[PDB]
C-alpha cells in the first residue's frame, strides 16, 4: 500500500570506484511544493569495497557515501566516510601483542576535514622465543609520531579523491608498517576509520564533473 | 549595582573630542587598559567584537540581544554567556545565557570578552537585617516584605483566618486579574526540586 507513492533512484558512486550503478534507493514521490530531491539530499549509504570494486581482496572495507545531488533517477554520492568491518579488526586484534592507535584531523586542501584513525599491532619475529612481543611506551610514542607524520604527508597536499584512492590502495598502512621496523615491527597496519567532519560549499557542477566525470550509467526506470 | 562599572574613553567618531562611555566592567579590566571595539578587534579580555568573530567556545558578557543595541544581556556580577554555535546561513548564533537557557541572536550583536567583575557576592550570607536594609535602600522601596498570611483579608487574598494559613491553592493562574495574582504565578510545578529541573 505504501509502495504506490514511491520512486526508485539509482545511486551513482564517484570516479574512484569501478562499479557506479548500485543501490536503487526508495523515496516518496512529489506532491507539488515538496519534492523528493531534498529528501534524498544526504542519504548516507554504507557500501562494501568488495562490491564497489568487485574484488574480494578489498571486501573488508565499508565506505559511506553521502548523496549530494540528483539528476533524473541518478543521485550522485560523494565520499563521506570509510571504515573496516567489525569482523576484520576484531580478528586483527589478538592478545599478547600491543596495539598502536593514532588519530588525526587533517585537511585535504579541498576544504574537507578528515578524521583518520589508524590501528597497528606489534609483530613477532620468526626466531622469537618469548610470548610477549610487547612494545615499550617510549617506542609506541615514537611509532605514533611516525604514524602522525606519515598520515599527514599522505592525505594533506592531496585532494580528497586521491585520498580515497590511497585508502583503497592502502599505501598508508604499508608505509607505516615499513617504517615501523626501526622502532617496533608492526603488522596489519590499516586505517580503522575515516570520517568527513566539515565539508566546503557544494559546487554542484564540480561534484558532477570532477568527482564524477559524467558518464552517469543508464538509469533504468 | 553589584558589578563595578568602567568609564572607558574613546575618540569621537567625527568630532575632535573624547566620548567617555560607561560599561559594566570585565573581570580583570584595569585602568589604562586599551580595550578594542569592532569587527577587526582581537579575541582578548575586555574587547568588544561582533558575535561572529568569536570561536565556538568563547565566554562573553555585556552581550547584545539585537544589532546596534547596546549590551542588554549578561550584565550582573559574575555573569557570562558562552557562544555555543554559529550559523552563516542566517548570520545568527546560539549562545548559552547565565540562566542556563540557549538564546539565538544575530551574529552582528556585539559582546565583551570575559566575566563581569564583582563575582562571588552571593557566596556570603547576609548576617543581619541591617545589611539587607542598606542593600535595598539604594535600589528601591521593597524591603522588608510583609507576608500575606500575616495581613487582613482587606489587604491580601491570603489574610485573615484564626490560624495564619492560605485556605486555597497558592498556585494561581496566568490569566488571573491583577489583584488575585498573588502566590505562585502560573507555576508548572511545586515542592522540592530533585533530580532534574
Amino acid at each position: 500500500d505504501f509502495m504506490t507513492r514511491k520512486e526508485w533512484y539509482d545511486v551513482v558512486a564517484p570516479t574512484t570506484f569501478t562499479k557506479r550503478s548500485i543501490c536503487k534507493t526508495l523515496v516518496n514521490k512529489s506532491v507539488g511544493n515538496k519534492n523528493c530531491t531534498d529528501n534524498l539530499k544526504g542519504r548516507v549509504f554504507e557500501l562494501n569495497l568488495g562490491d564497489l570494486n568487485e574484488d574480494e581482496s578489498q571486501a573488508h572495507r565499508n565506505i559511506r557515501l553521502r548523496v549530494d545531488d540528483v539528476v533524473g533517477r541518478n543521485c550522485l554520492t560523494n565520499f563521506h566516510g570509510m571504515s573496516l568491518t567489525t569482523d576484520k579488526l576484531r580478528s586483527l586484534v589478538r592478545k599478547w601483542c600491543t596495539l598502536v592507535e593514532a588519530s588525526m584531523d587533517l585537511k585535504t586542501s579541498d576544504g574537507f576535514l578528515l578524521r583518520i584513525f589508524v590501528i597497528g599491532f606489534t609483530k613477532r619475529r620468526p626466531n622469537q622465543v618469548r610470548k610477549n612481543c610487547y612494545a615499550q611506551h617510549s617506542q609506541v610514542l615514537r611509532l605514533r609520531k611516525k604514524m602522525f607524520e606519515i598520515i599527514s604527508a599522505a592525505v594533506t597536499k592531496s585532494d580528497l579523491q586521491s585520498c580515497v584512492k590511497k585508502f583503497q590502495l592502502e599505501t598508508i598502512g604499508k608505509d607505516i608498517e615499513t617504517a615501523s621496523s626501526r622502532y617496533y615491527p608492526l603488522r596489519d597496519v590499516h586505517v580503522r576509520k575515516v570520517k568527513v567532519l566539515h565539508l566546503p560549499k557544494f559546487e554542484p557542477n564540480k561534484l558532477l564533473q570532477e568527482v564524477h566525470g559524467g558518464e552517469l550509467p543508464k538509469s533504468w526506470e | 549595582r553589584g558589578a563595578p562599572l568602567a568609564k572607558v574613553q574613546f575618540r569621537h567618531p567625527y568630532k575632535f573630542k573624547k566620548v567617555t562611555h560607561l560599561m559594566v566592567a570585565c573581570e580583570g579590566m584595569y585602568v589604562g587598559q586599551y580595550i578594542y571595539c569592532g569587527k577587526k578587534a582581537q579575541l582578548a579580555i575586555g574587547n568588544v567584537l561582533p558575535l561572529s568573530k568569536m570561536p565556538e567556545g568563547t565566554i562573553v558578557c555585556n552581550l547584545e540581544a539585537k544589532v546596534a543595541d547596546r549590551s542588554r544581556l549578561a550584565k550582573a556580577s559574575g555573569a557570562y554567556a558562552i557562544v555555543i554555535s554559529h550559523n552563516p546561513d542566517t548570520g545568527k548564533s546560539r549562545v548559552k545565557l547565565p540562566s542556563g537557557q540557549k538564546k539565538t541572536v544575530s551574529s552582528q550583536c556585539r559582546a565583551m570578552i570575559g566575566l563581569i567583575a564583582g563575582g562571588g557576592r552571593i557566596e556570603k550570607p547576609v548576617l543581619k537585617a541591617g545589611n539587607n536594609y542598606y542593600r535595598f535602600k539604594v535600589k528601591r522601596n521593597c524591603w522588608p516584605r510583609v507576608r500575606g498570611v500575616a495581613m487582613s483579608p482587606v489587604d491580601h487574598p491570603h489574610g485573615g483566618g484564626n490560624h495564619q494559613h492560605i485556605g486555597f491553592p497558592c498556585t494561581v493562574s496566568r490569566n488571573a486579574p491583577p489583584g488575585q495574582k498573588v502566590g505562585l504565578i502560573a507555576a508548572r510545578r511545586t515542592g522540592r526540586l530533585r533530580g532534574g529541573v
Binding site: - | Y30, V31, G57, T58, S77, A117, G119, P125
Partner: protein, 90 residues
C-alpha cells in the same frame, strides 16, 4: 597570646547568627580584608576598595575583579580558555 580557637575575624559577631554562617563569613571576610598579590608590581598590596574594585597601594593599579577576593576562580579559568582560543585562531 592566642585570643580565639575557631572564631577568627568573626569575633565581632559574638554569639549571634549561627556557627555555620559565621564559618562562611569568616572565610569570606579574611579575604575581603587581606592584602592580595599584585601580578604587576610583585607586591601583596591589593586592597579591596568597593565590591569588585581592587586598588594596589604600591603600583597604583586599579583592577576590576572579585567581590571578596582579587581573582575569582572562574576568572582564572576564563583567562586561560580565552588565551587558548586566541592562540588557535591566530
Amino acid at each position: 597570646a592566642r585570643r580565639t580557637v575557631k572564631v577568627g575575624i568573626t569575633g565581632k559577631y559574638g554569639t549571634r547568627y549561627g556557627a555555620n554562617l559565621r564559618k562562611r563569613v569568616k572565610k569570606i571576610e579574611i579575604s575581603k580584608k587581606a592584602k592580595h598579590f599584585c601580578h604587576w608590581c610583585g607586591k601583596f598590596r591589593f586592597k579591596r576598595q568597593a565590591v569588585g574594585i581592587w586598588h594596589c597601594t604600591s603600583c597604583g593599579k586599579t583592577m576590576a575583579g572579585g567581590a571578596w577576593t582579587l581573582n575569582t576562580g572562574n576568572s582564572t579559568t576564563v583567562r586561560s580558555t580565552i588565551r587558548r582560543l586566541r592562540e588557535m585562531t591566530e
